[PDB]
Design a protein around this ligand. Structure first.
Ligand code: CL
Ligand code: CL
Ligand code: NA
Length: 129
């Protein structure tokens, strides 16, 4: 599923991402944009053999099981395929655990390089929330 900007913002807000751990809604929409282009089915392979999954490109190295990343952990206790659903519930709940592990949204490289220190409020501007 390819979300619309405002559509994703509303879904994220309904799942309690607005101001979660101090990160306003604009940060999450911005990260989703540059990680997956609002596409829930987005997958990308890393050099070490792990794969990033879904709207927020969650890594199989630590957070989900795809059965092909040897020596990896499953800290969100889910199959990686569940992160590709049109329902972002699984991706949101896992991201909450990720953003709480001490490093904040810095875990998302695209957020750190393209969202951090910008006007992220512009990503939810005009949206009915
Ligand atoms: Cl991640
Ligand atoms: Cl980047
Ligand atoms: Na894993």
């Amino acid at each position: 599923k390819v979300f619309g900007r405002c559509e994703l913002a509303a879904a994220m807000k309904r799942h309690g991402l607005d101001n979660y751990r101090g990160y306003s809604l604009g940060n999450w929409v911005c990260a989703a944009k540059f990680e997956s282009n609002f596409n829930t089915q987005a997958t990308n392979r890393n050099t070490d053999g792990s794969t990033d999954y879904g709207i927020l490109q969650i890594n199989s190295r630590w957070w989900c099981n795809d059965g092909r990343t040897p020596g990896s952990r499953n800290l969100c206790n889910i199959p990686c395929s569940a992160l590709l659903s049109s329902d972002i519930t699984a991706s949101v709940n896992c991201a909450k655990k990720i953003v709480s592990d001490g490093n904040g949204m810095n875990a998302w490289v695209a957020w750190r390089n393209r969202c951090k220190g910008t006007d992220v409020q512009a990503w939810i501007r005009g949206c009915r929330l």
